[PDB]
Amino acid sequence: LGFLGAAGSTMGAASMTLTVQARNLLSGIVQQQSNLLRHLLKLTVWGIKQLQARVLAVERYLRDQQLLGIWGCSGKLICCTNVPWNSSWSNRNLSEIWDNMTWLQWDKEISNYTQIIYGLLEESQNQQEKNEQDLLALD
Amino acid sequence: ENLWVTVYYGVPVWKDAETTLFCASDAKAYETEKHNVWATHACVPTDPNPQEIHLENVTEEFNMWKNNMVEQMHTDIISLWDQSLKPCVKLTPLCVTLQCTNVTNNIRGELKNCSFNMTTELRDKKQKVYSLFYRLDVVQINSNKEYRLINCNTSAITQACPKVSFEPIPIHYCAPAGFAILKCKDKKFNGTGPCPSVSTVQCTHGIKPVVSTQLLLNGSLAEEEVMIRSENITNNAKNILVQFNTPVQINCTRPNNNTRKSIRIGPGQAFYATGDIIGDIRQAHCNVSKATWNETLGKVVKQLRKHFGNNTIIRFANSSGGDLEVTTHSFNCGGEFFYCNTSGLFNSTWISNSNDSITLPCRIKQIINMWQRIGQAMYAPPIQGVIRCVSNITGLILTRDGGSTNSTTETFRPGGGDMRDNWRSELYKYKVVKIEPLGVAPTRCKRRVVG
Amino acid sequence: IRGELKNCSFNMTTELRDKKQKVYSLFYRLDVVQINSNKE
Ligand SMILES: *[C@@H]1O[C@H](CO)[C@@H](O[C@@H]2O[C@H](CO)[C@@H](O[C@@H]3O[C@H](CO[C@H]4O[C@H](CO[C@H]5O[C@H](CO)[C@@H](O)[C@H](O)[C@@H]5O)[C@@H](O)[C@H](O[C@H]5O[C@H](CO)[C@@H](O)[C@H](O)[C@@H]5O)[C@@H]4O)[C@@H](O)[C@H](O[C@H]4O[C@H](CO)[C@@H](O)[C@H](O)[C@@H]4O)[C@@H]3O)[C@H](O)[C@H]2NC(C)=O)[C@H](O)[C@H]1NC(C)=O
Ligand SMILES: *[C@@H]1O[C@H](CO)[C@@H](O[C@@H]2O[C@H](CO)[C@@H](O[C@@H]3O[C@H](CO[C@H]4O[C@H](CO[C@H]5O[C@H](CO)[C@@H](O)[C@H](O)[C@@H]5O)[C@@H](O)[C@H](O[C@H]5O[C@H](CO[C@H]6O[C@H](CO)[C@@H](O)[C@H](O)[C@@H]6O)[C@@H](O)[C@H](O)[C@@H]5O)[C@@H]4O)[C@@H](O)[C@H](O)[C@@H]3O)[C@H](O)[C@H]2NC(C)=O)[C@H](O)[C@H]1NC(C)=O
Ligand SMILES: *[C@@H]1O[C@H](CO)[C@@H](O[C@@H]2O[C@H](CO)[C@@H](O[C@@H]3O[C@H](CO[C@H]4O[C@H](CO[C@H]5O[C@H](CO)[C@@H](O)[C@H](O)[C@@H]5O)[C@@H](O)[C@H](O)[C@@H]4O)[C@@H](O)[C@H](O[C@H]4O[C@H](CO)[C@@H](O)[C@H](O)[C@@H]4O)[C@@H]3O)[C@H](O)[C@H]2NC(C)=O)[C@H](O)[C@H]1NC(C)=O
Ligand SMILES: *[C@@H]1O[C@H](CO)[C@@H](O[C@@H]2O[C@H](CO)[C@@H](O[C@@H]3O[C@H](CO[C@H]4O[C@H](CO)[C@@H](O)[C@H](O)[C@@H]4O)[C@@H](O)[C@H](O[C@H]4O[C@H](CO)[C@@H](O)[C@H](O)[C@@H]4O)[C@@H]3O)[C@H](O)[C@H]2NC(C)=O)[C@H](O)[C@H]1NC(C)=O
Ligand SMILES: *[C@@H]1O[C@H](CO)[C@@H](O[C@@H]2O[C@H](CO)[C@@H](O[C@@H]3O[C@H](CO[C@H]4O[C@H](CO[C@H]5O[C@H](CO)[C@@H](O)[C@H](O)[C@@H]5O)[C@@H](O)[C@H](O)[C@@H]4O)[C@@H](O)[C@H](O)[C@@H]3O)[C@H](O)[C@H]2NC(C)=O)[C@H](O)[C@H]1NC(C)=O
Ligand SMILES: *[C@@H]1O[C@H](CO)[C@@H](O[C@@H]2O[C@H](CO)[C@@H](O[C@@H]3O[C@H](CO[C@H]4O[C@H](CO[C@H]5O[C@H](CO)[C@@H](O)[C@H](O)[C@@H]5O)[C@@H](O)[C@H](O)[C@@H]4O)[C@@H](O)[C@H](O)[C@@H]3O)[C@H](O)[C@H]2NC(C)=O)[C@H](O)[C@H]1NC(C)=O
């Protein structure tokens, strides 16, 4: 275990842990609450690099976390979707990918049409599914 | 088979990108003596616990010449140096005609007793006082010699603050959230390539900004025999970094007993001139254990053997061309800036398979503008008292043998032409990556039908 | 003996604060104005 501890292991192992990566993603001991505590101008070059790094920290976290909210998966770490898998994406079989490719390799295998999957993802799970209440919310 | 897509938040995948990093260091200067030029009045404190994970099964490829952590390092030091000189005494009034004389030839003369006319506290009145200056920092104009500061011709001048430490202290570079720094834990790492032993430490090791020329000090050394790294070997032109396995100890000391003479030039501002010397004039020197040096120079030609024409003739020459301040082992020590003659170390040549100690002559300069920066130069005030530095020498910098088309032999003379390569000797193993926690994968699993 | 610029001579500091130097320069009209035989 550890942060990215299973980065080189098979995809089945990264499926098993996963939180250790998600936990250490927003806040860090490195930030350490700023201030010297314990000259009186904090306009130094260091303060500029820190604050612009604290911004992109939450700017990149919220850019990805906004994606989880529009897919109905905000509350959980792994959610299933109602989008069928299209064979043009990969020809490999069920146990052939989860035990032989590792995630590091997999991100390069879908990076071509990865944005296209994201487009179809907002539709089937939250554009129609959240709409389907119309008939079932009350009759 | 009705395979459905499923999302996974926190997937261990990354892509090479370079973001803005920041400082980290614990209790250093503090109360007794602070105001360090680099660590400022406050850096974010480093965690006492360092986090290193031996990433398994991974073989990420590094590149130390196309790595941007060294370029971020370069522009940070420049902006950090200029910020530590901006609020201080400017020495614009120091540009007057200087009438100077030798010192005690006794009819041996390398400093001059300068008399000149300078503004006082009151703008109306003027004052004449003496001061001593080193050679080359002043030049003649056209019976009684007449001189001028070498920088008044070029750019402006600003005195270094009196209570500022130019001592390199460890500065840690660490990543921003969603980022990680990858460490090459492979001992042998010829140039750069796929590293089998990677770690994803959140924070680098203790990196000291040792401002050095040609030869590196207080650096990091891998355990194997001396490493040789070139962006491209055989492109005679590209410079060569050299990592030792065991560092040599070189101690330097300035025997001059400088007295402090503070003369005001207007209000609050006070120029710190060299006073009158106490004791016989002695040239500054550097000691190198001749025994320790002969073997370090030998292990390199053994490693260089397998990289340059196998078994043939490898010679070492003195710098070769260039300017006086870049061809000598320049550095800072205690506040005064030394320039030592390296021709005494790169003269031997071995090929075909209580104790004496080499010494190096050194001169001192008080006028400096480093990193070939023609914007503004600074005057380093003379350090009152005794001077002694004792730092390990861990790295080296080499250069060409001209353009010998094939032929008989190869020679490598030192040439610390640039400053950014000095930090590349400390950053060969690191590289930062951007974590992408979003991964999508198929599995025969779908959520509830209606909702 | 057509005139809208003037050949100006004036006294100005040099590189060394101690010494001074005199050089000429041309300036456009209206950018300069008189004060009170030889114009000033
Ligand atoms: C590569 O790394 C090396 C190794 O780090 C590095 O070399 C170091 O360089 C720094 C400067 O860059 C040196 O630090 C300076 O030291 C000056 C001289 O004093 C030194 O030695 C003192 C010896 O004390 C012992 O003996 C005395 C009696 O002789 C006794 O009282 C003591 O108790 C002790 O037994 C030592 O004390 C002193 O520093 C500590 O203690 C004194 C009080 O004892 C205190 O005043 C200091 O603040 C400190 O806590 C020091 O080690 C020193 O003058 C200088 O500046 C300070 O003093 C001046 C004097 O006026 C003040 O004006 C100023 O405000 C400061 O307080 C500074 O501390 C260091 O010694 C070198 N090496 C060592 C041994 O660590 C190289 O530079 C690096 N490479 C490069 C790029 O150069
Ligand atoms: C970098 O450059 C700077 C430049 O400033 C250097 O700093 C300078 O260092 C020099 C070193 O020589 C200093 O000169 C010193 O001046 C003081 C003060 O002047 C008094 O004494 C003078 C004596 O005459 C000198 O020369 C004769 C020549 O033979 C010598 O014999 C003699 O020993 C002296 O060196 C007096 O002329 C002066 O006049 C008034 O008082 C007199 C008192 O009686 C003296 O003279 C009589 C004869 O008349 C003698 O019998 C008697 O013994 C005594 O010497 C009086 O007679 C006279 O009528 C007047 O009333 C002063 O009293 C001297 O005391 C030192 O001996 C020396 O000459 C510079 O002062 C100093 N600069 C400054 C800031 O002033 C700096 O050193 C250099 N860098 C280094 C390496 O540090
Ligand atoms: C580089 O140059 C500097 C500047 O000279 C050197 O700095 C001085 O060097 C000397 C010699 O190495 C040191 O040693 C001695 O210090 C003695 C103590 O003086 C200090 O404390 C005094 C307290 O009282 C003492 O003196 C009184 C008399 O006034 C006695 O009654 C009493 O018992 C004490 O002994 C203070 O009053 C004084 O101001 C100092 O703070 C000195 O007394 C001694 O003086 C002798 O030598 C002098 C020349 O150095 C000479 O002029 C005198 O007449 C006398 O013969 C001597 O100075 C100093 O401690 C040291 N510091 C300072 C600030 O002066 C430095 O050492 C040198 N580098 C090298 C290579 O040595
Ligand atoms: C030139 O080179 C010589 C030879 O290396 C140096 O002499 C050594 O100087 C170093 C550091 O200046 C000393 O190194 C270390 O001292 C440690 C002190 O112990 C503990 O506490 C400190 C303070 O909290 C901690 O920082 C430290 O980590 C320890 O917890 C030793 O414990 C170290 O030994 C072993 O463990 C560390 C822990 O990571 C490892 O990194 C080490 O590799 C090692 O396995 C270490 O010894 C050292 O004692 C001096 N002697 C020797 C023979 O190395 C000169 O100082 C140096 N000069 C310069 C300025 O470069
Ligand atoms: C995602 O999908 C995109 C397509 O939308 C893929 O893009 C391809 O990327 C590759 C690699 O970057 C491109 O390869 C090209 O390589 C060139 C050098 O050699 C190429 O040509 C050689 C001879 O060329 C002849 O035959 C080719 C055959 O296509 C013709 O196109 C030529 O006109 C000539 O007739 C070939 O032998 C050799 O294999 C190479 O094709 C280089 O000059 C190009 O800039 C380029 O890098 C490829 O061209 C891109 N796509 C297409 C179809 O053009 C991308 O890889 C996909 N990513 C993943 C991982 O899925
Ligand atoms: C500092 O700033 C000054 C002023 O701006 C710069 O100018 C020189 O300053 C020095 C003093 O440090 C001058 O030298 C001195 O001149 C004194 C008198 O000058 C007048 O007489 C001179 C001839 O001497 C006769 O008269 C004197 C009267 O005392 C008798 O003692 C002699 O025996 C002679 O009979 C003339 O040359 C001068 O023009 C005056 O009329 C003199 O008494 C001193 O002994 C000394 O010589 C010097 O003249 C100033 N100007 C020059 C030409 O440099 C100075 O340069 C600035 N800084 C430096 C570099 O020092």
Ligand SMILES: *[C@@H]1O[C@H](CO)[C@@H](O[C@@H]2O[C@H](CO)[C@@H](O[C@@H]3O[C@H](CO[C@H]4O[C@H](CO[C@H]5O[C@H](CO)[C@@H](O)[C@H](O)[C@@H]5O)[C@@H](O)[C@H](O)[C@@H]4O)[C@@H](O)[C@H](O)[C@@H]3O)[C@H](O)[C@H]2NC(C)=O)[C@H](O)[C@H]1NC(C)=O
């Ligand atoms: C630049 O800065 C200067 C100085 O601060 C400003 O002052 C004027 O500078 C000019 C030179 O450019 C001066 O004019 C010159 O004066 C020379 C000698 O002056 C002395 O004698 C004058 C009378 O001349 C007699 O003696 C000379 C000796 O050479 C003989 O050649 C003559 O034939 C006469 O017998 C006196 O008036 C003067 O006060 C001196 O005692 C002279 O030789 C030159 O030919 C020339 O005339 C001028 O005097 C300075 N002062 C004035 C009043 O302006 C200057 O203004 C600044 N910039 C400008 C605007 O130019």
Ligand SMILES: *[C@@H]1O[C@H](CO)[C@@H](O[C@@H]2O[C@H](CO)[C@@H](O[C@@H]3O[C@H](CO)[C@@H](O)[C@H](O[C@H]4O[C@H](CO)[C@@H](O)[C@H](O)[C@@H]4O)[C@@H]3O)[C@H](O)[C@H]2NC(C)=O)[C@H](O)[C@H]1NC(C)=O
């Ligand atoms: C590269 O290294 C070689 C040595 O490996 C070196 O050759 C040696 O140079 C030294 C110094 O020039 C020579 O030593 C001199 O020998 C002559 C007689 O041949 C003596 O007269 C000299 O004595 C005077 O100078 C000494 C200081 O240099 C004083 O201490 C002495 O009192 C005298 O005033 C002096 O001993 C030496 O002979 C050669 N050869 C050898 C084999 O040692 C070469 O110069 C180096 N090149 C560079 C540019 O570094």
Ligand SMILES: *[C@@H]1O[C@H](CO)[C@@H](O[C@@H]2O[C@H](CO)[C@@H](O[C@@H]3O[C@H](CO[C@H]4O[C@H](CO)[C@@H](O)[C@H](O)[C@@H]4O)[C@@H](O)[C@H](O)[C@@H]3O)[C@H](O)[C@H]2NC(C)=O)[C@H](O)[C@H]1NC(C)=O
């Ligand atoms: C560090 O070690 C690395 C791993 O070995 C080095 O990387 C290797 O670099 C070489 C040169 O850049 C690559 O390619 C070589 O090409 C030569 C030339 O082949 C052509 O000419 C020869 C005759 O001269 C002929 O026989 C061939 O058919 C070709 O026409 C080959 O001779 C070599 O065998 C080799 O293919 C390597 O591919 C590359 N290795 C890899 C993949 O890592 C690196 O250069 C070393 N140095 C540094 C600073 O990193």
Ligand SMILES: *[C@@H]1O[C@H](CO)[C@@H](O[C@@H]2O[C@H](CO)[C@@H](O[C@@H]3O[C@H](CO)[C@@H](O)[C@H](O)[C@@H]3O)[C@H](O)[C@H]2NC(C)=O)[C@H](O)[C@H]1NC(C)=O
């Ligand atoms: C740098 O200057 C220092 C002195 O300030 C020189 O250090 C001293 O070097 C000698 C070399 O013989 C050491 O002698 C021996 O040290 C061993 C331990 O290593 C000890 O067991 C012996 O009894 C003997 O003392 C001496 O200790 C050492 N001093 C210290 C404390 O480092 C040094 O040699 C100079 N550099 C060069 C170029 O030699």
Ligand SMILES: *[C@@H]1O[C@H](CO)[C@@H](O)[C@H](O)[C@H]1NC(C)=O
């Ligand atoms: C997958 O989608 C692409 C683009 O619409 C389409 O060309 C392809 O035929 C689809 N494959 C199937 C049958 O899932």
